[PDB]
Design a protein around this nucleic acid. Structure first.
Ligand SMILES: [Zn+2]
Lengths: 52, 636, 109, 96
RNA sequence: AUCCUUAUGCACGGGAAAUACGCAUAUCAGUGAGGAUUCGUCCGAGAUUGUGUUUUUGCUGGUUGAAAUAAUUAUAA
C-alpha cells in the first residue's frame, strides 16, 4: 500500500560485484566500496545499538 | 505551505497530495450594482443576471472612472476582465461623446485591445459587438487572418488586434495619425512577457511612450493579467500609478481550484507510463461517478489518440454503459451525426465511445465539432494537447495534466512543464457559470513535485525574455528613425521591460555592472554595442564604435516592414545569390527561421512520401528533413 | 436533443440516369490504369468504384458489376424514378428500331 | 491496378506496399536539381590550343552568352541553339 | 558484580534445502504413536487421512526490433 519505503538491496562484500541496482558499482569503484562497507557496518552497528 | 496541503493520500502506484479549495474572500466592500451607472452605460450589462459586480470588479471600476491613469489588474481572469475593459472603453467613448447630445463622436477616440491569440481576438470581438451595439460602434479585427486594409482602420473605432499585427501596424510610418488617435490601449494577458511573444508587448509599450513625442499626449494603458508576483515592478515598467495597481489572489476566483498532485515513484518509462495511465484511469473513475465532465492534457498530439484508445479499452473493460446511461438514443444520434460525417483522423471511434480528443492536427470543422459536443456533454472525457487552455474559454469540471517533460525545439531537449503554461491549463476548471468548484490534477514524477508546488503557487516573476528579441526590435526602431545614437538607444531601453527587471535583480539576469551604474547606463550601452555589431554584420544598420552615428539600411527597413527575425534575415543574406534558381528558392524559404519549430511526423510521413514522388519542383533534401516537408507543403 | 431522440426512435438526375444506363462509358473507371492515390461499404470510400444508387463503393470490378447485375441494385435504381429495366416484337421493333440503328449508326459514322 | 483472376482480367484496388520506386538518376528530379551546379563549370575553361591562322575566318565568342547557355543546358541531354553575328570593320575575317 | 549451562525471543554474520514447507470443525497418540534387538530386551514421538504450493513465494535493476517530440502568428495588396 506504500506506507513504508521500498527496500533497497542488501549488499555484502560477496554481493558487492553482483549488485547493479544501485549506481557506481563499477563507475565509482572505491566510493562504492565505501557504500557497501558503510552499509554492512551500518547494519552491524545498528545491531549493536539494538543490543545496547 | 502547510495550509496549502490539507490532506495527503498514499497509494501503491503513486503518492497523491490533495490541496483543499482556496478560501472565500473577506468582504470589506460593497457589491457595485448596475443602476448606479449613468444613462448610456446601463446597457453595458444587457443581461444583468446578478445586477451586482463580481468581488474583483466594482472597486477597480469606480477607480477606473475616477482616475485617468495607467492601470494593472492581476486577477483570476474569471470573466471579470472582459466587463472591466468594456467599461473603460465606454468611459473613453463618453469623454469624446456628449451625455446630452447622443451623436457618437466617431473620429475623435480610437481603441486598441491586444489579445495574444487570433481565436481569443475573435471571441472578444463578438463580445464587444454585443455590449457596444447601442452606441453604433464598429468593432472589427485588425490582425492576421482579419485582413483589414488601409481604409477600414480609419472607418473603425474599436480595434481588437493580436500583439504581432498591432506591432507591425504601429511600426509603419505612414499611419501615425491613427496611432495618435488611439486614446485607449488595452493589453490583455500582460503575463505573456514571460513567454517569447511577450517581447512584442514590451516593444509596443516602449514605442507608445518613447516614439510619439512630437504630438506627445500619452494614451491610457490598461494591463489585464492572471495574478502574478512582482506586480510593483510591473508598474514601474509601465507607469503604473500606485493606485491603479490591483493585485487579487486566487481567493477571489469564481470557482476555487482544488489542487492535486500524483507523484510517480517509478523510473523506467515502460512501467512509468503504465502507472500514469492507471492513475489517470483511477481519477476518471472517481470523477465520472459524480457526473463530472473531464479534460486530460498531455504533451504531444500523437499521445492523445493512443491515450483515448487506452481509456476506451480499459474504461470499457471496467464498465461500458455508465459513460452513456442517459439519452442513449440521442447520444447515438448526435454522435453519429458528428463523428461519422466530417471526421477523418480515425478519431470517429473515440468520439463514438464518448471519450473524445482535441488537438492541433484535427480538422478545423472536426475541431469546432469536438468543442460543441463536449459543451453539450455527450463527451464525458476530453483528451487534449495544450491548445485549449491557451485558446478557448470552455471550462470543464475536472482537469488532469498528464506528464512533465515537453520537447521544446528551442533547446532541442525535453524540459519540464513551464509554469506559465501550467497555470493557464489550471485556469480552465469547474465552470464559473454553473458548477461550484474545479478539480485540478497534475500527473507527474515525484522528484519534480517539490518544484511544481512552488511554481504552482504563482510565486514566479514574469521572466523578461528581451535578450533574444532586442536586436530585431532595435532594428525596427532605427528604421523608424527614432534612434540616431547609442544614448538614444539606451534611453529607449530605459522604458524597456528588461530594464526594470535588471534593476530588480541584476545578478539573476547577468548584470556584471551591479554596484556600478545604478541606472545601468554602461550596461544599457553595452547591450546596444552588442546589438549594433551583429546588425552591422547583417548590414541592417550603420554604426561606428568611437564616433557613434546610427542610420537604417534598406535590408533593415525590409526586416522592419515584414517583421523578419534577424536570424531569418542573415540566412536570406547569404543563402540568396546572383545565380540562385527556382529549386534553391524553396529551400531558402524552408530555411526561414520561423520554421525552426517545424518537424516531420510519422503519421505525416506516408502522405509526404506520396507527394515527393510526384512533386513538380524537385527537393535537394529528403523526407526526414523538415525543410523538405516545408517546401513540399508550400508546393501543395 | 429532442430531435435526435425522435430520429433514433431533376434534369441532373436524368443525366445521372443517362450515365448509369449506358455501360460503355460506365465500364471505364480505370482511366488511371496503374496509379497511386493518396487519401462496411456505406456512403463511399472516396476510392474504388462508385455506386451512387445504393451509395456503396467497391474495390474490385466483379463486385461492382456483379452488384449491378444483382436485383437489389436494380430495385433501388428503379425506385429512384421508374421501371425501365424490366421494360412481343410486333415487327415494328426491328423495322423502326433497327432502321434507327442503321440511321443512328450512319449519323455517328 | 489491373489483375488477372482465373481465366479472367479484373481491375483491382491494391494496398500495403507496392510503393518501392527507383527513378534515381533519371527524369526531371535528379537532373533538374543537378542544374544549379552548372555555373560552377565555367570557373575553369580551357581548350587544346590550335595554331592561329589568318587564312580562314576566325570567331570571337563572349564569356556571358556561353555562361547563360551552360546554365540553360542540361547535364545529360544535348541542348543546341543557332548562333548569328557579322564581320566587324577592324577585320572582315573576324566574326563576332 | 564477573563468568558459565539449558530453553525462548530478538537480530549481525556464515552456510544447506525447498522432493520440501505447511494447513486441517478429520482420526488416533507417552492411558504409548512409531521403530529397533545380540531374543534377554532396547529407543521414545508423532502416525493416519484429506488438501495448498512445490522446475518455486514478494519485490527490483539492466539490455533489447516487445513497445511507448508541445502553440502560434506576423507582410506591402
Ligand atoms: Zn448498387
Amino acid at each position: 500500500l506504500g506506507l513504508l519505503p521500498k527496500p533497497e538491496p542488501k549488499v555484502k562484500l560477496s554481493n558487492m560485484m553482483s549488485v547493479f541496482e544501485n549506481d557506481q558499482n563499477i563507475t565509482d569503484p572505491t566510493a562504492w566500496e565505501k557504500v557497501v562497507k558503510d552499509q554492512v557496518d551500518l547494519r552491524k552497528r545498528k545491531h549493536l545499538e539494538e543490543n545496547e | 505551505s502547510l495550509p496549502e496541503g490539507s490532506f495527503k493520500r498514499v497509494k501503491p502506484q503513486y503518492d497523491e497530495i490533495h490541496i483543499p479549495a482556496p478560501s472565500k474572500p473577506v468582504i470589506d466592500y460593497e457589491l457595485k450594482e448596475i443602476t448606479s451607472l449613468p444613462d448610456w452605460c446601463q446597457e453595458a450589462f444587457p443581461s444583468s443576471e446578478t445586477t451586482s459586480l463580481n468581488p474583483i470588479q466594482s472597486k477597480v471600476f469606480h477607480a477606473a472612472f475616477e482616475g485617468d491613469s495607467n492601470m494593472l489588474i492581476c486577477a483570476p481572469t474569471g470573466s471579470g476582465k472582459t466587463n472591466i475593459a468594456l467599461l473603460t472603453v465606454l468611459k473613453a467613448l463618453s469623454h469624446h461623446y456628449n451625455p446630452k447630445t447622443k451623436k457618437l463622436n466617431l473620429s475623435a477616440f480610437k481603441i486598441v485591445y491586444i489579445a495574444p491569440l487570433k481565436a481569443l481576438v475573435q471571441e472578444q470581438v463578438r463580445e464587444f459587438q454585443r455590449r457596444l451595439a447601442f452606441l453604433g460602434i464598429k468593432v472589427a479585427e485588425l490582425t492576421g487572418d482579419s485582413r483589414l486594409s488601409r481604409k477600414q482602420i480609419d472607418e473603425t473605432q474599436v480595434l481588437v488586434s493580436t500583439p504581432e499585427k498591432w506591432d507591425i501596424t504601429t511600426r509603419n510610418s505612414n499611419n501615425l495619425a491613427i496611432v495618435e488617435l488611439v486614446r485607449l490601449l488595452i493589453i490583455d494577458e500582460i503575463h505573456l512577457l514571460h513567454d517569447d511573444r511577450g517581447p512584442v508587448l514590451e516593444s509596443i509599450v516602449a514605442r507608445t511612450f518613447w516614439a510619439s513625442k512630437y504630438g506627445q499626449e500619452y494614451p491610457r494603458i490598461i494591463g489585464l493579467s492572471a495574478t502574478l508576483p512582482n506586480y510593483e515592478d510591473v508598474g514601474r515598467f509601465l507607469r503604473v500609478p500606485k493606485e491603479g495597481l490591483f493585485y487579487f489572489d486566487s481567493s477571489f476566483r469564481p470557482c476555487p481550484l482544488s489542487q492535486q498532485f500524483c507523484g510517480i515513484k517509478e523510473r523506467n518509462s515502460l512501467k512509468k507510463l503504465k502507472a500514469m495511465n492507471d492513475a489517470c484511469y483511477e481519477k476518471v473513475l472517481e470523477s465520472i461517478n459524480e457526473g463530472n465532465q473531464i479534460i486530460v492534457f498531455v504533451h504531444s498530439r500523437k499521445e492523445t489518440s493512443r491515450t483515448a484508445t487506452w481509456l476506451k479499452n480499459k474504461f470499457a473493460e471496467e464498465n461500458i454503459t455508465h459513460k452513456l446511461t442517459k439519452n442513449d438514443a440521442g447520444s447515438k444520434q448526435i454522435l453519429k451525426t458528428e463523428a461519422a460525417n466530417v471526421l477523418d483522423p480515425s478519431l470517429r471511434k473515440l468520439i463514438e465511445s464518448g471519450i473524445g480528443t482535441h488537438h492541433a492536427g484535427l480538422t478545423r470543422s472536426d475541431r469546432s465539432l469536438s468543442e460543441d459536443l463536449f459543451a453539450d456533454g455527450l463527451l464525458q472525457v476530453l483528451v487534449c494537447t495544450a491548445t485549449l487552455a491557451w485558446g478557448v474559454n470552455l471550462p470543464a469540471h475536472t482537469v488532469i495534466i498528464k506528464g512533465t517533460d515537453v520537447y521544446s525545439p528551442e533547446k532541442g531537449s525535453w524540459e519540464q512543464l513551464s509554469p506559465q503554461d501550467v497555470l493557464q491549463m489550471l485556469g480552465r476548471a469547474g465552470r464559473p457559470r454553473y458548477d461550484t468548484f474545479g478539480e485540478g490534477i497534475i500527473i507527474t514524477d515525484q522528484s519534480n513535485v517539490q518544484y511544481y508546488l512552488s511554481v504552482l503557487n504563482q510565486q514566479l516573476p514574469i521572466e523578461s525574455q528581451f535578450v533574444s528579441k532586442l536586436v530585431d526590435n532595435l532594428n525596427a526602431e532605427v528604421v523608424a528613425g527614432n534612434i540616431k545614437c547609442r544614448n538614444d538607444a539606451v534611453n529607449w531601453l530605459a522604458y524597456t521591460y528588461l530594464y526594470v527587471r535588471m534593476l530588480a535583480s541584476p545578478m539573476l539576469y547577468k548584470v556584471p555592472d551591479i554596484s556600478s551604474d545604478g541606472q545601468l547606463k554602461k550596461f544599457r550601452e553595452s547591450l546596444v554595442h552588442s546589438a549594433l555589431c551583429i546588425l552591422k554584420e547583417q548590414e541592417l544598420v550603420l554604426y561606428d564604435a568611437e564616433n557613434d552615428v546610427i542610420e537604417a539600411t534598406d535590408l533593415g527597413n525590409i526586416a522592419s516592414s515584414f517583421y523578419i527575425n534577424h536570424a531569418s534575415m542573415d540566412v536570406y543574406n547569404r543563402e540568396l545569390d546572383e545565380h540562385t534558381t527556382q529549386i534553391d528558392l524553396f529551400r531558402i524559404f524552408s530555411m526561414s527561421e520561423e520554421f525552426k519549430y517545424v518537424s516531420v511526423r510519422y503519421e505525416e510521413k506516408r502522405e509526404l512520401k506520396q507527394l515527393l514522388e510526384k512533386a513538380p519542383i524537385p527537393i535537394r533534401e529528403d523526407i526526414d528533413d523538415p525543410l523538405a516537408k516545408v517546401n513540399v507543403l508550400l508546393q501543395s | 436533443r429532442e430531435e435526435y431522440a425522435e430520429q433514433a426512435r431533376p434534369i441532373e438526375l436524368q443525366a445521372l440516369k443517362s450515365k448509369y444506363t449506358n455501360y460503355d462509358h460506365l465500364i471505364k473507371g480505370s482511366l488511371k490504369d496503374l496509379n497511386k492515390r493518396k487519401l462496411s461499404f456505406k456512403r463511399g470510400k472516396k476510392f474504388g468504384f462508385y455506386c451512387d444508387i445504393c451509395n456503396l463503393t467497391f474495390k474490385d470490378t466483379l463486385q461492382y458489376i456483379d452488384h449491378l447485375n444483382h436485383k437489389v441494385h436494380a430495385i433501388k435504381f428503379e425506385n429512384l424514378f421508374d421501371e425501365p429495366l424490366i421494360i412481343d416484337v410486333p415487327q415494328e421493333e426491328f423495322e423502326l428500331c433497327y432502321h434507327n440503328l442503321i440511321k443512328d449508326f450512319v449519323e455517328v459514322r | 491496378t489491373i489483375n488477372a483472376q482465373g481465366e479472367e482480367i479484373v481491375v483491382v484496388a491494391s494496398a500495403d506496399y507496392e510503393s518501392q520506386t527507383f527513378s534515381s538518376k533519371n527524369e526531371w528530379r535528379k537532373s533538374a536539381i543537378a542544374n544549379t551546379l552548372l555555373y560552377l563549370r565555367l570557373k575553369n575553361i580551357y581548350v587544346s590550343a590550335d595554331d592561329f591562322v589568318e587564312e580562314q575566318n576566325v570567331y570571337v565568342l563572349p564569356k556571358n552568352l556561353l555562361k547563360k547557355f551552360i546554365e540553360i543546358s542540361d547535364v545529360k541531354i544535348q541542348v543546341a541553339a543557332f548562333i548569328y553575328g557579322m564581320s566587324a570593320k577592324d577585320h572582315p575575317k573576324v566574326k563576332e
